Structure 1
Amino acid sequence: ELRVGLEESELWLRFKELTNEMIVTKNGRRMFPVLKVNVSGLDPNAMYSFLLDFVAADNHRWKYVNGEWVPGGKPEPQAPSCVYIHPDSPNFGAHWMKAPVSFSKVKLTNKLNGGGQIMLNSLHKYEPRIHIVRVGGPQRMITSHCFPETQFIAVTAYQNEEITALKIKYN
């Protein structure tokens, strides 16, 4: 059985209990915390690519009103985000299982851009999601996993200073 776990869930949970926020910039901002995933149960000799995308958790715009995030406009359909390919991809199962898979180089933006960076809508809520894609085999296979603990709202600056303070404390 292919097993996927979140590394440092303890920490992500401190962010989640406050309502997590991630900065997006025209050029793209790296995430903190970084999504790091423990994976077991791959074929060590099989060849996999790790993908990351961001599901819009609801159809609404969010706003920070009197120290609290609350839902906003009319329901708008949210198209899926673009996919980020882990730069170690493609790689042997052994490679992916030897250390946590860390998405430290993904950059989040609010502007359609050259490449690399993933465009999100500011003031929307997102749930990170990975796809583990067995490549180069005869038999194609995808396994997906969501990380509720890692949910955030995309912001062009932090609103809740409790988040600002945790970000600095742990970075």
Structure 2
Amino acid sequence: ELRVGLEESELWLRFKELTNEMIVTKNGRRMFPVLKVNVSGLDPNAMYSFLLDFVAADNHRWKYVNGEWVPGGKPEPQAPSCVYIHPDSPNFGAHWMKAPVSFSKVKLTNKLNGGGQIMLNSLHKYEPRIHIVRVGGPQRMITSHCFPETQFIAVTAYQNEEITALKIKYN
């Protein structure tokens, strides 16, 4: 059975309980914390690519009002984000299962940009999601996993200083 688990969930939960924020910039900003995923139950000898994308958790624009995050009243459809390919991809089941799969190099932007960077809408709430794509084999296969613990609002600067403090304390 293919098992997908979040490394350092206790750390992510500290951020989640304050409402997590991730900086987006024109040129793209790396995430902290970094999404790290424990994977077991792969075929050590089969071939897989690991894909990361961001689901809009709701259709609303958020705003920090009197020290609290609040949704707008005017929802809009949120197009799914573009996918980031883990740079170790493609690779053998054994490679992926030998240490936590770390997305340390993904960069979050607010501008349609060249290559690599994933564009997110500022002040939208997002839920990180991976796809494990079996490649090369005759039977293509995808398994998807969401990480509720890693939800965040995309921001151009931190609103909640409690988040600023946690980011510095644990970097």
Please classify the TM superposition score into its range, dividing by the shorter chain length.
over 0.9
Taking the aligned partners of 1:7 and 1:73, their CA distance within structure 2 comes to: 35
Shift, 1:94, TM fit: 0.2
Shift, 1:108, TM fit: 0.1
Shift, 1:24, TM fit: 0.1
Taking the aligned partners of 1:123 and 1:113, their CA distance within structure 2 comes to: 19
**Is the aligned partner of 1:107 residue 2:107?**
yes
Normalised by the length of structure 1, the TM-score is 1.00
Taking the aligned partners of 1:87 and 1:140, their CA distance within structure 2 comes to: 20
Normalised by the length of structure 2, the TM-score is 1.00
Over 2 Å off, 4+ runs: none
Taking the aligned partners of 1:72 and 1:65, their CA distance within structure 2 comes to: 11
| Residue aligned with 2:17, SS | helix
Residue number in structure 2 paired with 1:135: 135
Shift, 1:91, TM fit: 0.3
Q: Is there any run of 5+ residues in structure 1 with no aligned partner, and where?
A: none
Q: Is there any run of 5+ residues in structure 2 with no aligned partner, and where?
A: none
Shift, 1:75, TM fit: 1.2
**Is the aligned partner of 1:126 residue 2:126?**
yes
Residue number in structure 1 paired with 2:166: 166
Shift, 1:73, TM fit: 4.1
What value does the CA root-mean-square deviation take over the aligned residues? 0.4
**Is the aligned partner of 1:15 residue 2:3?**
no
> Structure 1, residues 25-57: CA drift from partner, whole Å, max 9, x if none?
000000000000000000000000000000000
> Structure 1, residues 113-154: CA drift from partner, whole Å, max 9, x if none?
001000000000000000000000000000000000000000
Fraction of identical pairs, as percent? 100
Taking the aligned partners of 1:72 and 1:33, their CA distance within structure 2 comes to: 27
